[PDB]
Amino acid sequence: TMPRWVPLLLGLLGSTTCGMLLYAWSVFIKPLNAESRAEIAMAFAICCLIFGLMTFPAGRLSDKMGPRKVVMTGGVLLAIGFILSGFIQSKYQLYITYGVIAGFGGGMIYLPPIATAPKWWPDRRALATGFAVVGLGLGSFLMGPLATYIIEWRYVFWYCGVAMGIMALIAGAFLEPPPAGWKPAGAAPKVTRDWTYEEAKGDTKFWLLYLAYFCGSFAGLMVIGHLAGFGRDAGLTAMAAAGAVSSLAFSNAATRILSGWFVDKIGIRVYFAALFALQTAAMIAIFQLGGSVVGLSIVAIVIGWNYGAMFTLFPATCLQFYGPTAQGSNYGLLFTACGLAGFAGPWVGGWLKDTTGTYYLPFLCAAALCALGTAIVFMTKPPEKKHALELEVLFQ
Ligand SMILES: CCCCCCCCCO[C@@H]1O[C@H](CO)[C@@H](O)[C@H](O)[C@H]1O
Ligand SMILES: CCCCCCCCCO[C@@H]1O[C@H](CO)[C@@H](O)[C@H](O)[C@H]1O
Ligand SMILES: CCCCCCCCCO[C@@H]1O[C@H](CO)[C@@H](O)[C@H](O)[C@H]1O
Ligand SMILES: O=C(O)c1ccccc1S
Ligand SMILES: [Hg+2]
Ligand SMILES: [Hg+2]
Ligand SMILES: [Hg+2]
Ligand SMILES: [Hg+2]
Ligand SMILES: [Hg+2]
Ligand SMILES: [Hg+2]
Ligand SMILES: [Hg+2]
Numbered sequence: 001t002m003p004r005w006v007p008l009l010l011g012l013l014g015s016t017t018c019g020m021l022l023y024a025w026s027v028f029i030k031p032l033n034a035e036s037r038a039e040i041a042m043a044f045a046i047c048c049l050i051f052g053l054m055t056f057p058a059g060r061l062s063d064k065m066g067p068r069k070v071v072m073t074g075g076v077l078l079a080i081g082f083i084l085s086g087f088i089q090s091k092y093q094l095y096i097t098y099g100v101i102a103g104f105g106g107g108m109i110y111l112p113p114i115a116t117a118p119k120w121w122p123d124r125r126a127l128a129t130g131f132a133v134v135g136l137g138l139g140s141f142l143m144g145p146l147a148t149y150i151i152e153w154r155y156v157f158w159y160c161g162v163a164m165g166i167m168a169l170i171a172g173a174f175l176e177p178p179p180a181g182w183k184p185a186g187a188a189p190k191v192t193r194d195w196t197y198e199e200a201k202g203d204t205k206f207w208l209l210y211l212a213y214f215c216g217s218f219a220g221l222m223v224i225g226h227l228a229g230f231g232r233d234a235g236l237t238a239m240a241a242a243g244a245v246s247s248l249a250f251s252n253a254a255t256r257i258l259s260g261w262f263v264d265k266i267g268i269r270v271y272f273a274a275l276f277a278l279q280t281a282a283m284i285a286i287f288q289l290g291g292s293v294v295g296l297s298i299v300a301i302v303i304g305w306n307y308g309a310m311f312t313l314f315p316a317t318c319l320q321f322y323g324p325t326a327q328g329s330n331y332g333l334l335f336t337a338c339g340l341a342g343f344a345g346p347w348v349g350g351w352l353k354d355t356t357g358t359y360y361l362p363f364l365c366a367a368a369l370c371a372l373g374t375a376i377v378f379m380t381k382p383p384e385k386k387h388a389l390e391l392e393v394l395f396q
Contacts, residue, residue, distance in 0.1 A: 001178075001179065002174075004120040004121065004178075004184045006174060007113065007116055007117045007119075007120050007128070007175065008117060008120075008128060008131040008132075009131075010113055010116075010117070010170075010171045010172075010174060010175045011113035011114065011116075011117045011128075011131045011132030011133070011134075011135070011171070012131050012132075012134060012135050013135070013167045013168070013170060013171035014071060014109045014110065014112075014113045014132070014135065014167070014168060014171040014172070014175075015110065015113065015131075015132055015133050015134060015135025015136050015138075016135030016136075016138050016139065016142065016167065017075075017078070017106070017109055017135065017164045017167045017168045017171070018106050018109055018110045018135055018136050018139075019135045019136040019137060019138050019139025019140075019142075019143075020139045020142065020143045020160060020163075020164055021047070021051075021078065021082075021102060021103075021106045021139070021164070022136060022139055023139030023140050023143050023144065023147075024082075024098075024139075024143070024147075024156070024157075024160065025040070025041075025043060025044040025047070025098070027143075027144070027147045027148070027151065027156065028040070028153060028156070028157075029041075031151055031153030032094070032153065034153075039091055040094075041346075042091075042095065042099075043091075043094045043095050043098045043099045044098075044099075045099070045342075045343055045346070045347070046095050046098075046099025046100060046103065047098055047099045047102060047103040047106075048103070048339065048342030048343050049099075049103070049339060049340075049342070049343040050099060050100050050103030050104050050107065051103040051104075051106050051107040051110065051339065051342075052107065052335060052336055052337075052338050052339015052340065052341075052342055052343070053107070053336055053339050054103065054104050054107035054108060055107045055110060055111040055331075055332045055335040055336065055339070056332040056333050056335070056336050057332070058070050058074065058107055058108040058110075058111040058112060058328075058332060059111050059112075059115060059328035059329045059330075059331060059332020059333070060197075060328065060329050060332060061108075062111065062112040062115055062116070062328040062332075063115070063197070063326060063328040063329045066176060066177075067112030067113070067115065067116045067172070067175050067176065067177070067328070068172050068173065068174075068175050068176055069172075070108050070111075070112050070172070071108065071109050071112050071113070071168060071171055071172025071175055072168070072169055072172040072173065073105075073108055074104070074105040074106065074107065074108025074109040074110075074168060074172070075105065075109060075164070075165050075167075075168025075169045075171075075172055076105065076165065076169070077101055077102075077104050077105025077108065078101075078102050078104075078105030078106050078109060078161075078164055078165065078168060079105070079161050079162065079164060079165025079166075079168070080101055080105070080161075080165075081097055081098060081100075081101035081102030081103075081104075081105055081106075081161070082097075082098075082102060082157050082158070082160060082161025082162075082164060082165075083157065083158055083161040083162065083165075084097045084101065085097035085098045085102065085157045085161070086154045086155070086157030086158040086161065087154070105168075109168045109171070109172070110136075111328065111331065111332050111335065112172075112175065112328065113132040113171065113175060114129055114132040114133060114315050114327075114331060115315075115324075115327040115328035115331060115332075116132075116175060116176070116177055116328075117129065117131060117132045118132075118319060118324060118327070119177045119178055119324050119327075120177075120178055120184055122183060122324075124260075124261075124264050125264065125316060125319055125320075125324075126259070126260035126261070126263045126264045126268070126312055126313070126316040127257065127260040127261050127264055128260075129260055129312050129315045129316050129319070130256045130257045130258075130259070130260030130261070130312040131257070133256050133311045133312055133315075134253060134256040134257055136256075136311070137249060137252045137253025137254075137256060137308060138253055140249055141249075141253075143160060147160075187395075188392065188395040188396070189392070189395060190387070190392065191387075191388045191391045191392045192385045192386060192387060192388060193323070193386050193387075193388040193391070194322060194323025194324060194325040194326060194386070195321070195322035195323055195326060195330075195383075195386055196326055197326045197329035197330060197333075199322075199386070200318075200321070200322040200326065200330045201330070201333060203321075203322075203383060205321060205380055205382075205383050206318075206321070206322075206330070206333075206334070208376050208380050209314065209317060209318065209321075209334060209376070209377075209380065210333075210334055210337045211337075211372070211373075211376060212276075212372070212373040212376040212377050212380075213310065213314050213334060213335075213337040213338055213341075214337040214338075214340065214341050215369035215370065215372050215373040215376075216276060216279070216306075216307070216310050216369070216370060216373045217310065217337065217338040217341035217342065217345065218341040218344070218345040218348075218366075218369055219279065219283065219345075219365075219366035219367070219369040219370050219373075220279075220303065220306075220307040220310075220345075220366075221341055221342055221345035221346050221349075222345045222346060222348055222349030222352075222362050222365065222366050223283065223303070223349060223362055223363055223366045224248070224303065224307070225346055225349065225350075226349060226353065226359060226362060226363075227241075227245040227248070227286075227290075227296065227299070227300055227303070228241045228242050228244075228245045229241075229359075230286060230290045230296070230359055231244060231245065231290060231291070231293075231296045233359070234290055234291030234292075235291060236291070236292075236293065236296070240293050241293075241296060243293065244293045244294075244296040244297045244300060245296060245297075245300045246300075247297050247300050247301050247304070248300035248301065248303060248304035249304065250301070250304070251300075251301040251302070251304035251305040251308065252304035252305070252307060252308035253308065254305075254308075255304070255305045255306075255307075255308040255309045255312070256308050256309070256311060256312050257312075259271070259275070259308075259309040259312050259313060260312040260313075260316065263312075263313065263316060268313060268316055268317055268320060269317075269377065269378065269380075269381065270378070271313075272309070272313045272317065272377050273374055273377045273378035275305070275306045275309045275310075275313070276306065276370055276373045276374040276377055276378075277370075277374045278302060278305075278306055279302070279303065279306035279307070279370045279373075280367050280370035280371050280374060281302075282299050282302045282303050282306070283363050283364070283366045283367035283370060284363075284364075284367050285299060286299045286359075286363060287359075287360075287363070310338075311338075314331075314334060314335075315327070315331045315334075317377075318330050318331050318334055319331075320382055321382045321383055322383075348362075348365075349362040349365075349366070350362075352365060
């Protein structure tokens with residue numbers, strides 16, 4: 001049929017499309033304001049909400065009618081989203097074009113490779129997931145310099161939108177699970193089977209993981225935007241604080257592959273719980289390390305490592321608990337937690353800071369959420385593997 005590393009390249013393409021989506025708004029704040037900063041950020045808020053919710057229908061549709069159709073619809077929708085975002089005049093115009101259309105298309109791109117790629121790597125599920133999610137830490141390294149080039153803004157929307165449409169159409173074009181029979185390899189039994197979606201959705205462990213995903217995502221999104229202002233409040237220059245926090249991008253991208261590889265070799269739960277614990281420690285430690293370039297860098301690298309790991313390790317966990325046949329539907333549901341979090345978290349962090357005027361409230365709230373997540377992730381072990389009596393009774 002085809003070499004099983006191609007779905008990795010596909011997930012990389014799709015997720016890199018998605019990372020470009022996530023990166024664009026940051027470069028658009030100054031150009032758009034040139035023609036309120038909060039008023040712009042509402043478009044990114046809608047983008048995060050629509051993306052995170054639409055993974056759910058994208059996952060159900062991928063499981064029902066295959067991932068090719070969904071990734072390609074998402075590519076057309078996101079391409080239209082960006083290209084129409086270029087021909088805008090109002091704020092509501094941007095909300096619609098970028099927040100809704102683009103978020104819809106991007107979510108439909110994002111989910112199906114995460115579900116599909118591991119099916120090709122039953123030997124390396126987490127690493128395959130990682131390739132399907134690693135593009136989201138690559139948007140900067142590809143788009144950023146060229147973005148600055150073309151700005152020095154409508155052109156960035158139009159041209160990047162075309163490029164993303166093409167990458168998503170290619171990534172979806174060649175994307176599909178392995179054929180039903182053969183799995184890519186190199187007295188009566190007791191036949192088990194993967195969980196159905198209705199069975200997993202009704203499982204309590206699913207909702208404990210859901211809660212842990214919400215906590216981790218919410219903490220990261222509530223503080224990440226504040227790291228550099230923490231540094232400037234401690235006496236650093238804007239440029240020095242900014243340099244320091246920028247290392248976070250490197251660690252956020254690398255963790256998606258590295259954690260996947262690591263938990264493939266040794267297992268998920270304790271490493272994942274360790275990453276959560278370390279994130280909790282970082283939310284507290286910033287008050288001691290955050291006032292110097294080297295210290296603020298260490299905190300940024302740790303936070304990024306932990307945060308990014310979430311997006312390989314939650315699907316890897318979900319895959320371990322319930323199996324791969326319904327991974328589109330199960331992970332589509334579960335990601336809606338990061339959907340709600342990306343909607344509301346950044347706003348909450350800003351509001352707590354303003355309320356007290358200080359970074360104690362958001363950082364300690366985020367440390368509490370990561371503590372809850374540590375407990376949930378560490379104590380939650382996989383559920384009973386299901387018994388397939390309706391197949392078991394075929395053996396004479
Ligand atoms: C934003 C953080 C909130 C995460 C936790 C949300 C709990 C929502 C309730 O879940 C319910 O649990 C039952 C079994 O436990 C299921 O049978 C039922 O179908 C499901 O609706
Ligand atoms: C900054 C912290 C980095 C993570 C270091 C913790 C690695 C955990 C290794 O323990 C292993 O975990 C597996 C279960 O998941 C099992 O094989 C077994 O219980 C144990 O051998
Ligand atoms: C002195 C004021 C209180 C400080 C310590 C408690 C912080 C309570 C803020 O609530 C926040 O609201 C979000 C709403 O979605 C939830 O995610 C979550 O429960 C929590 O992060
Ligand atoms: O990895 C993701 O998919 C993500 C989702 C929502 C917000 C930020 C990110 S970085
Ligand atoms: Hg957002
Ligand atoms: Hg988005
Ligand atoms: Hg976290
Ligand atoms: Hg999210
Ligand atoms: Hg708090
Ligand atoms: Hg909190
Ligand atoms: Hg809460």
